[PDB]
Amino acid sequence: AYKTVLKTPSGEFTLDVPEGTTILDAAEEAGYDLPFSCRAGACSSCLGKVVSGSVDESEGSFLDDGQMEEGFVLTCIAIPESDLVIETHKEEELF
Ligand code: FES
């Protein structure tokens, strides 16, 4: 649904993420490969960083408030509230 740009280590990819759809799910659907392990919001495997737009990552229990203020997001659980630009594969820098 909302136009989402994934800036991944292999390039920028635009996809349409439907409302109520997690970023991870829509990307997989599109055929993109993004990191993940628990898929429940309790690790940092699927860590990304929101560059613009907003998401609802209310389900997550891993990031502290300062991390969220910084723009860190758990892509397996985040649902877009607008058009977004997100950096993926963020654990690979800041585990
Ligand atoms: S895969 Fe564990 S929080 Fe997203």
From Swiss-Prot:
Q: Which Pfam families match?
A: Fer2
What does this protein's record comment on cofactor binding? Binds 1 [2Fe-2S] cluster.
Q: What Gene3D superfamilies does the entry give? A: 3.10.20.30
Coiled coil, from the record? none
Q: Which cofactor does it need?
A: [2Fe-2S] cluster
Q: What is its main location?
A: plastid
Q: Name one GO biological process term.
A: electron transport chain
Q: Name one GO cellular component term.
A: chloroplast
Key words of the record: 2Fe-2S, Chloroplast, Electron transport, Iron, Iron-sulfur, Metal-binding, Plastid, Transport
Q: Which domain of life is it from?
A: Eukaryota
Q: Identify the residues that bind [2Fe-2S] cluster.
A: 38, 43, 46, 76
Q: Which residues form the 2Fe-2S ferredoxin-type domain?
A: 2-92
Location in or out of the cell? Plastid, Chloroplast
GO terms for MF: 2 iron, 2 sulfur cluster binding; electron transfer activity; metal ion binding
Q: Which family does it belong to?
A: Belongs to the 2Fe2S plant-type ferredoxin family.
| Matching PANTHER family | FERREDOXIN (PTHR43112), FERREDOXIN-2, CHLOROPLASTIC (PTHR43112:SF3)
Describe its function. Answer: Ferredoxins are iron-sulfur proteins that transfer electrons in a wide variety of metabolic reactions.
- What's this protein's name? Ferredoxin-1
